[PDB]
Design an enzyme around this catalytic site. Structure first.
Site, short mmCIF file in Angstrom:
data_model
loop_
_atom_site.label_atom_id
_atom_site.label_comp_id
_atom_site.label_asym_id
_atom_site.label_seq_id
_atom_site.Cartn_x
_atom_site.Cartn_y
_atom_site.Cartn_z
CD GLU A 1 -2.58 1.68 -0.30
OE1 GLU A 1 -2.85 2.75 -0.31
OE2 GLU A 1 -2.99 0.45 -0.60
CD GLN A 2 -0.40 4.76 -3.95
OE1 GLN A 2 0.15 4.64 -5.25
NE2 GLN A 2 -1.29 5.97 -3.98
CG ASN B 1 1.08 7.18 5.77
OD1 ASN B 1 1.23 7.50 4.80
ND2 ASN B 1 1.72 7.79 6.83
N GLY C 1 -7.11 1.02 4.41
CA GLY C 1 -8.77 0.71 4.45
C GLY C 1 -9.18 0.89 3.09
N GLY C 2 -8.56 1.53 2.07
CA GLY C 2 -8.73 1.61 0.74
C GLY C 2 -9.59 2.92 0.60
CB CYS D 1 -14.57 2.22 0.52
SG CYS D 1 -15.93 2.15 1.57
CG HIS E 1 -46.87 -0.45 10.95
ND1 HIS E 1 -47.53 0.02 9.94
CD2 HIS E 1 -47.57 0.57 12.02
CE1 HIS E 1 -48.22 1.09 9.67
NE2 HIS E 1 -48.33 1.57 10.96
C1 LIG Z 1 -16.34 10.22 -4.08
C2 LIG Z 1 -16.74 8.66 -4.16
C3 LIG Z 1 -17.60 8.03 -3.63
C4 LIG Z 1 -18.01 6.81 -3.68
N1 LIG Z 1 -19.19 6.35 -3.29
C5 LIG Z 1 -19.49 5.09 -3.28
C6 LIG Z 1 -20.78 4.47 -2.95
O1 LIG Z 1 -21.69 5.30 -2.53
N2 LIG Z 1 -20.91 2.83 -2.86
C7 LIG Z 1 -19.93 2.09 -3.55
O2 LIG Z 1 -19.95 0.95 -3.59
N3 LIG Z 1 -18.89 2.75 -4.00
C8 LIG Z 1 -18.52 4.05 -3.83
N4 LIG Z 1 -17.12 4.67 -4.30
C9 LIG Z 1 -16.01 3.61 -5.07
C10 LIG Z 1 -15.21 3.13 -3.71
O3 LIG Z 1 -14.66 4.05 -2.92
C11 LIG Z 1 -14.33 2.13 -4.59
O4 LIG Z 1 -15.01 1.73 -5.65
C12 LIG Z 1 -13.95 0.74 -3.66
O5 LIG Z 1 -13.49 1.03 -2.51
C13 LIG Z 1 -13.51 -0.28 -4.40
O6 LIG Z 1 -12.11 -0.48 -3.89
P1 LIG Z 1 -11.08 -1.49 -4.59
O7 LIG Z 1 -11.40 -3.10 -4.30
O8 LIG Z 1 -11.32 -1.26 -6.30
O9 LIG Z 1 -9.88 -1.18 -4.30
P2 LIG Z 1 -9.33 0.49 -3.97
O10 LIG Z 1 -9.81 1.17 -2.45
O11 LIG Z 1 -9.68 1.21 -5.27
O12 LIG Z 1 -7.85 0.19 -4.15
C14 LIG Z 1 -6.93 1.41 -4.16
C15 LIG Z 1 -5.74 1.49 -3.20
O13 LIG Z 1 -4.59 0.94 -3.69
C16 LIG Z 1 -3.64 1.79 -3.67
N5 LIG Z 1 -2.56 1.46 -4.60
C17 LIG Z 1 -2.92 1.88 -5.87
N6 LIG Z 1 -1.89 1.58 -6.57
C18 LIG Z 1 -1.01 1.06 -6.06
C19 LIG Z 1 0.31 0.68 -6.26
N7 LIG Z 1 0.86 0.72 -7.21
N8 LIG Z 1 1.14 0.13 -5.17
C20 LIG Z 1 0.48 0.28 -3.92
N9 LIG Z 1 -0.65 0.55 -3.64
C21 LIG Z 1 -1.39 1.18 -4.81
C22 LIG Z 1 -4.15 3.52 -3.40
O14 LIG Z 1 -3.21 3.97 -2.72
C23 LIG Z 1 -5.27 2.69 -2.75
O15 LIG Z 1 -5.36 2.87 -1.16
C24 LIG Z 1 -17.08 5.84 -4.34
C25 LIG Z 1 -15.73 6.55 -4.80
C26 LIG Z 1 -15.54 7.92 -4.52
C27 LIG Z 1 -14.48 8.32 -4.95
C1 LIG Z 2 -48.16 3.45 22.48
C2 LIG Z 2 -48.40 2.32 21.27
C3 LIG Z 2 -47.49 2.05 20.36
C4 LIG Z 2 -47.68 1.02 19.17
N1 LIG Z 2 -46.69 0.78 18.37
C5 LIG Z 2 -46.69 -0.24 17.68
C6 LIG Z 2 -45.71 -0.46 16.81
O1 LIG Z 2 -44.50 0.25 16.78
N2 LIG Z 2 -45.95 -1.26 15.74
C7 LIG Z 2 -47.23 -2.01 15.54
O2 LIG Z 2 -47.30 -2.81 14.81
N3 LIG Z 2 -48.11 -1.64 16.44
C8 LIG Z 2 -47.89 -0.87 17.45
N4 LIG Z 2 -49.18 -0.43 18.23
C9 LIG Z 2 -50.12 -1.23 18.21
C10 LIG Z 2 -51.19 -0.61 17.17
O3 LIG Z 2 -51.59 0.64 17.57
C11 LIG Z 2 -52.38 -1.35 16.98
O4 LIG Z 2 -52.15 -2.81 17.28
C12 LIG Z 2 -53.17 -1.51 15.56
O5 LIG Z 2 -53.69 0.00 15.60
C13 LIG Z 2 -54.19 -2.46 15.32
O6 LIG Z 2 -55.32 -2.16 15.96
P1 LIG Z 2 -56.88 -2.78 15.67
O7 LIG Z 2 -56.95 -2.68 13.88
O8 LIG Z 2 -57.09 -3.79 16.36
O9 LIG Z 2 -57.88 -1.64 15.87
P2 LIG Z 2 -57.62 0.10 16.59
O10 LIG Z 2 -56.42 0.56 15.72
O11 LIG Z 2 -57.17 -0.24 17.95
O12 LIG Z 2 -59.05 0.49 16.19
C14 LIG Z 2 -59.89 0.80 17.30
C15 LIG Z 2 -60.99 1.75 16.95
O13 LIG Z 2 -62.39 1.15 17.27
C16 LIG Z 2 -62.95 2.24 17.92
N5 LIG Z 2 -63.93 1.62 18.78
C17 LIG Z 2 -63.57 0.86 19.96
N6 LIG Z 2 -64.65 0.57 20.60
C18 LIG Z 2 -65.93 1.05 19.87
C19 LIG Z 2 -67.10 0.79 20.06
N7 LIG Z 2 -67.86 0.05 21.00
N8 LIG Z 2 -67.88 1.42 18.74
C20 LIG Z 2 -67.42 1.91 17.77
N9 LIG Z 2 -66.09 2.19 17.75
C21 LIG Z 2 -65.37 1.72 18.61
C22 LIG Z 2 -61.85 3.31 18.45
O14 LIG Z 2 -62.43 4.59 18.97
C23 LIG Z 2 -60.91 3.21 17.46
O15 LIG Z 2 -60.83 4.17 16.61
C24 LIG Z 2 -48.89 0.63 19.21
C25 LIG Z 2 -49.99 0.70 20.20
C26 LIG Z 2 -49.58 1.66 21.14
C27 LIG Z 2 -50.74 2.02 22.28
CU LIG Z 3 -49.69 2.07 14.64
CU LIG Z 4 -17.11 1.65 -0.08
#
Ligand SMILES: Cc1cc2nc3c(=O)[nH]c(=O)nc-3n(C[C@H](O)[C@H](O)[C@H](O)COP(=O)(O)OP(=O)(O)OC[C@H]3O[C@@H](n4cnc5c(N)ncnc54)[C@H](O)[C@@H]3O)c2cc1C
Ligand SMILES: Cc1cc2nc3c(=O)[nH]c(=O)nc-3n(C[C@H](O)[C@H](O)[C@H](O)COP(=O)(O)OP(=O)(O)OC[C@H]3O[C@@H](n4cnc5c(N)ncnc54)[C@H](O)[C@@H]3O)c2cc1C
Ligand SMILES: [Cu+2]
Ligand SMILES: [Cu+2]
Ligand SMILES: [Cl-]
Ligand SMILES: [Cu+2]
Ligand SMILES: [Cu+2]
Ligand SMILES: [Cu+2]
Ligand SMILES: [Cu+2]
Ligand SMILES: [Cu+2]
Ligand SMILES: [Cu+2]
Ligand SMILES: [Cu+2]
Ligand SMILES: [Cu+2]
Ligand SMILES: [Cu+2]
Ligand SMILES: [Cu+2]
Ligand SMILES: [Cu+2]
Ligand SMILES: [Cu+2]
Ligand SMILES: [Cu+2]
Ligand SMILES: [Cu+2]
Lengths: 432, 441
Positions: free
Chosen positions: A29-30, A32, A36-37, A39, A417
């Site tokens: 690696e050329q 320091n 890590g490359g 990336c 959800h």
């Molecule tokens: C701005 C930017 C954004 C990017 N974003 C993404 C992204 O979102 N997702 C993604 O998948 N990729 C992304 N890439 C690409 C990613 O950085 C590289 O394609 C990835 O690291 C591939 O690595 P590689 O296996 O080809 O080896 P590389 O990491 O490309 O190897 C190059 C290394 O070899 C060394 N080297 C070169 N010649 C010599 C030599 N003669 N002797 C010794 N050492 C040498 C270099 O100094 C360097 O350390 C991005 C690149 C850039 C520039």
């Molecule tokens: C704090 C909190 C966090 C939660 N977080 C998550 C989560 O991250 N992920 C997830 O998947 N679930 C979550 N839940 C659960 C989710 O809210 C319920 O499971 C979902 O809404 C399913 O409810 P349901 O279809 O049984 O009916 P509900 O959605 O409970 O509908 C009940 C409805 O019936 C009405 N009703 C009740 N009694 C009567 C009646 N006698 N006559 C007429 N209308 C009536 C009420 O007014 C209300 O409008 C959470 C619940 C709570 C309390």
């Molecule tokens: Cu919900």
């Molecule tokens: Cu990468």
């Protein structure tokens, strides 16, 4: 033994796996500042650490300060994982190819098997004054800005350019995108590119298409983008021109490794090159420039070396990607233009973000959902998810497409959800 | 009025979905709702949405009143949208009033301006649940005590918030108010914090809550609640604690007493729940029960699946069933949230199977560092004979999303190797499943 040139996602992963199986490993690696490359140090981690701080509208330099400690921790971390296994020598030098068998590092190293992981480098457009002008940075230099620029200019309408355009817009800067094509995001559906553009237009970002950039000057405290008698004055200029493989001063002709025109090493389905015991994984291949694809390049090489390897590059179905704007665009599979261009008749289905309660919980009801279903097999051909946490919920669409399951299991799935993945229930229920 | 082909009792998740699907199929539908502030169901108004709206604001350390202001805007937008999405269909009659069973065919709706009588060819019970009030003297009269509903309408952030109940909803409120800057003291009667989870993740949750200032006390039999001088006093075994506000988080139980189901031949257990088939069939013919009124798991997506059961019976394709349910996931919306599916390590140990438990600290997930929240842990259980996964414990940021990925391959019977080798998005939290199941021998 084995020698891997380049700290990369595939390189560092192969070096640790080889060391644990009893191989003597030597990773070269050329820099320091690059443990890590790309990336870890100048790529995804620094770019999206700042993207996450921008969507909260915090101070820009306070977020740069925080990006500096998340990359410093990971830089020390990745060097710690490599040098604390005994087999791996970490040679801090730049390597050069002498022949098939041996490498010269700036010390000469001989290796039974060499693995090229040098990645890619930023290409500059041949515009006069692009290097001669201060205030002109690529992605790496821009990430080290000392102050927030008031007006940011970007050369390139690419995904990397759109990320920084929406990233700096949330920080408080005026952003001007200079794109040369006739369309914004030409690799995308036009309804999707229209939405992304509208989200950027509302945050002050001007999308300038058919942009002619003749020269770039510096005058009166600001950078000037010349354009046939019309100058745009910005305080800093990012250039998102894309990256091409880094096979220049490796001198790979000595090892008999054929290169194509762009500089990418010609490689096999199972990542073999022209030379007998040489490999190339990652961006250096010329394929998709993603960190996960490089890790799978390690999977393909590891199966060959340590199992008995069926693993091939003909295994990668439905490679997803994400553009970490706000909200991020995630995409897997084909687009509407691609699905219509082929013979199978399709049904396109759209769910607006206004109908997702979880997006209301997170105070961002922007974007839309979209997917393509094949009426012949009830399977999914593509999905464009422009919403909050789209980078996480697209992995579900990709995995079901890999197993070839129909859209109905996502229509009838019991999700959590409230989540963003549960909107897939609402999405694929509009299919007939 | 006339006789409705379908009468739904309550604006719950299942019933408000059935009403739209039956009106769209031509049925004359009537939905009874006893409260005009409960349009859209328990979730929209007093459940998931206002709770999670505040947690998202509490994670940003936003002023409490501003978050309550935004909470109001979200509950009121979706309440008006949920009412109109039903009231605009010609075949739906949203009828305000408290419903009561006269027969197995007719209802008595209670509106203060004179009663009405409503008949139904089929009737669907969807009344949901209600707060359980523990039998502690001075809980109904003391002013500073609140339910889950009343606590979300507070006007001022209490400097010290007390919780009666170590349940999942209480822990949810523990982080939410401790994020807003409040000291919290949750009192649990059991001797173990979160006894249905593993000790390793229960310990992790306790320390995450402890460093935020939340005091967790077990072995608590509270015996009296008093308002002495501007702060609620809860008296206990030998000690006493004073807090600014007291929240009852002692679970919810089905609300059936005011429905009077006995008059229709509808059986009930001692909890108050309506007994149902695997097809959500009550003991009376042409009467269904959906949601938390069934005594089932109190989730919105289980009530939604209840709609799927009854929609599969009324609109064709034979029959889905509650026997179709497997690996039901759930999530505890703290910071970071705790998502789960399958069995814990405790149950997997006792089973006698040949299991392998892999553990990955969240500090090793680079995307968690990208979001400034490297707290939590990942752990799952692999069965060695079949290579399948028996359960997972995802205590991380965005755990509520990637837990649906783990549930995916568990339902499809795929091995752990699928998630160990999948090409995930990057940077992501779902991609850490590559590193989590690489730890399998
Ligand atoms: C701005 C930017 C954004 C990017 N974003 C993404 C992204 O979102 N997702 C993604 O998948 N990729 C992304 N890439 C690409 C990613 O950085 C590289 O394609 C990835 O690291 C591939 O690595 P590689 O296996 O080809 O080896 P590389 O990491 O490309 O190897 C190059 C290394 O070899 C060394 N080297 C070169 N010649 C010599 C030599 N003669 N002797 C010794 N050492 C040498 C270099 O100094 C360097 O350390 C991005 C690149 C850039 C520039
Ligand atoms: C704090 C909190 C966090 C939660 N977080 C998550 C989560 O991250 N992920 C997830 O998947 N679930 C979550 N839940 C659960 C989710 O809210 C319920 O499971 C979902 O809404 C399913 O409810 P349901 O279809 O049984 O009916 P509900 O959605 O409970 O509908 C009940 C409805 O019936 C009405 N009703 C009740 N009694 C009567 C009646 N006698 N006559 C007429 N209308 C009536 C009420 O007014 C209300 O409008 C959470 C619940 C709570 C309390
Ligand atoms: Cu919900
Ligand atoms: Cu990468
Ligand atoms: Cl189960
Ligand atoms: Cu904003
Ligand atoms: Cu160590
Ligand atoms: Cu030299
Ligand atoms: Cu030598
Ligand atoms: Cu300007
Ligand atoms: Cu000019
Ligand atoms: Cu040279
Ligand atoms: Cu914090
Ligand atoms: Cu209205
Ligand atoms: Cu009868
Ligand atoms: Cu008692
Ligand atoms: Cu006392
Ligand atoms: Cu005593
Ligand atoms: Cu009564």
């Amino acid at each position: 033994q084995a020698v891997i040139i380049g700290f990369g996602k595939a390189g560092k992963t192969l070096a640790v796996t080889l060391a644990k199986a009893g191989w003597r490993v030597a990773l070269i690696e050329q820099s320091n500042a690059m443990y890590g490359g790309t990336c870890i140090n100048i790529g995804c981690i620094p770019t999206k650490t700042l993207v996450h701080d921008a969507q909260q509208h915090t101070d820009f330099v306070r977020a740069i300060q925080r990006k500096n400690e998340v990359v410093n921790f990971l830089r020390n971390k990745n060097f710690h994982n490599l040098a604390d296994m005994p087999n791996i020598d970490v040679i801090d030098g730049q390597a050069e190819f002498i022949n098939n068998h041996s490498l010269r590092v700036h010390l000469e190293i001989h290796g039974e098997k060499i693995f090229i992981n040098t990645g890619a480098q930023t290409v500059v457009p041949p515009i006069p004054g692009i290097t001669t002008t201060p205030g002109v940075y690529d992605s790496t230099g821009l990430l080290n800005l000392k102050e927030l620029p008031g007006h940011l200019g970007i050369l390139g309408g690419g995904y990397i350019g759109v990320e920084f355009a929406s990233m700096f817009a949330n920080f408080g800067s005026k952003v001007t995108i200079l794109e040369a094509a006739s369309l914004f995001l030409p690799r995308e559906d036009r309804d999707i590119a229209d939405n992304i553009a509208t989200i950027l237009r509302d945050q002050g970002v001007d999308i300038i298409l058919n942009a002619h950039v003749e020269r770039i000057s510096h005058h009166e405290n600001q950078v000037q983008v010349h354009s046939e008698h019309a100058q745009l004055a910005v305080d800093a200029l990012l250039i998102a021109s894309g990256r091409q493989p880094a096979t220049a001063s490796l001198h790979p002709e000595n090892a008999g490794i054929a290169v194509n025109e762009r500089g990418a090493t010609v490689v096999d389905k199972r990542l073999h090159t022209t030379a007998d015991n040489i490999w190339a994984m990652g961006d250096v291949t010329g394929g998709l420039q993603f960190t996960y694809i490089s890790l799978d390049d390690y999977r393909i090489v590891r199966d060959e070396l340590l199992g008995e390897g069926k693993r091939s590059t003909d295994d990668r179905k439905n490679v997803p990607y994400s553009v970490f704007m706000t909200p991020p665009l995630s995409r897997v599979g084909m687009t509407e233009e691609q699905a219509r261009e082929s013979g199978a008749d399709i049904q396109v289905v759209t769910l607006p973000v206004a109908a997702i309660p979880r997006a209301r919980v997170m105070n961002d009801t922007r974007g839309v959902l979209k997917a393509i279903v094949d009426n012949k097999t009830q399977r999914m051909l593509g999905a464009s998810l422009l919403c909050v946490d789209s980078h996480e919920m697209i992995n579900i669409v990709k995995m079901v497409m890999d197993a070839g399951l129909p859209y109905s299991i996502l229509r009838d799935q019991i999700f959590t959800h409230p989540s963003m993945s549960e909107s897939l229930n609402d999405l694929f229920s509009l299919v007939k």
